[PDB]
């Protein structure tokens, strides 16, 4: 409207929102679809759901490789949103109990899930990179606000999906049975509308072309750099001052610098999967903690599961609260949060949140009687401080990480650093899956262990970020 914020981004978050909505509207019912429509084993349903989730988290690598090395972006976004819509059509077409049975349903559902994962993996990094591209490199202050609004749109979509999805699958009869066709059709229509709104702003975007087969050049440069040193019986200048400087006979300097920046950022991101895994282990253990505390609140009876909705909601309050106020206050004095102190402080806040959760668990355990009621029984409150702390940590880490990944990425490969971010998230989720089974510790000991692990991970990340040399 005024300046510094292109109209284009209007059709970059409204799309993102409309996408996240749809996604969360499909996953929420997904497991039930396996159990009560396809009538699958519990093990089979859980395994298929987890495989779909993992593929969704991992596909961002293929999405970015397609986007940056070829076809540019806004054409990978369009052509992968088309695949997303096709997968949605298949998935909603496989939930109709009229045609075929137990064979067409399974095949169509699996193909739709595969296509949905492929589309999501390539709509996720490319859309953020495109929205960032819409801003001039000079206007680095507005890009951070754009990324904050992007994250806010994602979280608003999540909250609205939680609040709206139970209405679709509640007491609806598609064809003499529960209406599972609608539960997938509505997300399909939402994704169609997201694609429509994104495409409507084609004349306004700032589509930058790709700089070539950047992935192939990067891999070849790394290969040559590692091969040159192998002077087993010789060698006078294998590669000095860096492990890439003497992969320079070929691969002109503009490519060596870009691959150097990529490798530096990857080395920085190495420890983030552990943080993602540890911070993910709070939507399950905190339910167990909530089940053991009072939830009447006098006014409204609050179930433990509903407490989950308190994390997205709080995010909606902190994204504008921080950016507009807290950060502003930090700028009053000489304090200079350089997008890497923000992430370290976020990790520290998450560690403190888990320590507070352990303290609350200890307080719960210290129960004694005076239907008998425990006098020292905690209300569902006292879970507010830990939710607030972990939510502040998540906001500060995620928004700053998006901005850092975009800002510290060479122009040729802007959308592969977003892929690296999402890949750290995916590996963290994989670690969560692997370590979920190993559960033999008390709740309080588990929480204190998670807090200590988060502290150590934050220490390692801070020590690695102190020596990080920013792109210039």
């Amino acid at each position: 409207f005024g300046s510094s914020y292109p109209v284009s981004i209007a059709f970059i978050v409204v799309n993102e929102f409309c996408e996240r909505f749809s996604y969360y509207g499909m996953k929420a019912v997904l497991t039930l679809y396996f159990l009560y429509f396809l009538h699958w084993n519990e093990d089979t349903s859980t395994s298929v759901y987890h495989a779909f989730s993992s593929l969704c988290y991992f596909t961002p690598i293929l999405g970015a490789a397609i986007a940056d090395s070829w076809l540019g972006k806004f054409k990978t976004i369009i052509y992968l949103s088309l695949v997303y819509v096709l997968g949605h059509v298949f998935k909603s077409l496989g939930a109709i109990p009229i045609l075929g049975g137990k064979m067409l349903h399974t095949i169509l559902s699996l193909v739709g899930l595969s296509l949905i994962a492929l589309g999501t993996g390539g709509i996720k990094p490319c859309v953020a990179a495109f929205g960032g591209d819409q801003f001039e490199e000079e206007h680095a202050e507005a890009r951070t606000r754009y990324f904050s609004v992007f994250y806010l749109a994602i979280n608003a979509g999540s909250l609205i999906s939680t609040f709206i999805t139970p209405m679709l699958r509640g007491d609806v009869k598609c064809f003499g049975q529960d209406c599972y066709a609608l539960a997938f059709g509505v997300p399909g229509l939402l994704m169609v509308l997201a694609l429509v709104v994104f495409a409507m702003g084609s004349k306004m975007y700032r589509k930058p072309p790709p700089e070539g087969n950047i992935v192939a050049q990067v891999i070849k440069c790394i290969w040559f750099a590692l091969c040159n040193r192998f002077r087993n019986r010789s060698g006078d200048l294998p590669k000095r001052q860096h492990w890439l400087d003497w992969a320079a006979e070929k691969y002109p300097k503009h490519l060596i610098a870009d691959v150097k920046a990529l490798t530096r950022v990857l080395f920085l991101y190495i420890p983030l999967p552990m943080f993602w895994a540890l911070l993910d282990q709070q939507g399950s253990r905190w339910t167990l903690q909530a089940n053991k505390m009072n939830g009447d609140l006098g006014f409204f009876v609050l179930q433990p599961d509903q407490m989950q909705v308190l994390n997205p909601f709080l995010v909606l309050i902190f994204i504008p609260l921080f950016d507009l106020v807290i950060y502003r206050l930090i700028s009053k004095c000489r304090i200079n949060f350089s997008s890497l102190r923000k992430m370290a402080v976020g990790m520290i806040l998450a560690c403190l949140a888990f320590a507070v959760a352990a303290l609350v668990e200890t307080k719960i355990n210290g129960m004694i009687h005076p239907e008998d009621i425990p006098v020292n029984k905690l209300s569902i409150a006292w879970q507010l401080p830990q939710y607030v702390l972990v939510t502040a940590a998540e906001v500060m880490f995620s928004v700053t990480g998006l901005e850092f990944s975009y800002s510290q990425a060479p122009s040729s490969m802007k959308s592969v650093l977003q892929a690296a971010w999402l890949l750290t998230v995916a590996v963290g989720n994989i670690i969560v899956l692997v370590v979920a089974q190993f559960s033999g510790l008390a709740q309080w000991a588990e929480f204190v262990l998670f807090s200590c692990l988060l502290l150590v991970v934050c220490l390692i990340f801070s020590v690695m970020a102190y020596y990080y040399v920013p792109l210039k």
Partner: nanobody
Amino acid sequence: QLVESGGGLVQPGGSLRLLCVASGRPFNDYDMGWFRQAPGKEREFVASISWSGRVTDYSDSMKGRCTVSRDNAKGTMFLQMSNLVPRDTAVYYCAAARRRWTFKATNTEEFYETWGQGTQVTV
């Protein structure tokens, strides 16, 4: 393995609590199901309870209200029908399937690999 069953005659509008006890491998490895075979009919599906009992499903008929429960300690599973009608005067079978990965429907006799003998609940 070696599943069993227990039940007998009930009043026309009464209730029963059918049993199923496993006398072998652990009860935590088995997804269980209740079927019925009315005289001169086929084996219909009555209920299914997954390992750990976290997932429970009932046939479309589910005459009255049927509830399936199971405790893995001592390996014993219950079915609690409540609002029986002169119908459903069939023989009830308990079936067990070892946990595994399959695409076969959990509401079919093919999924279950060990069918124990059945009771003769009548009305």
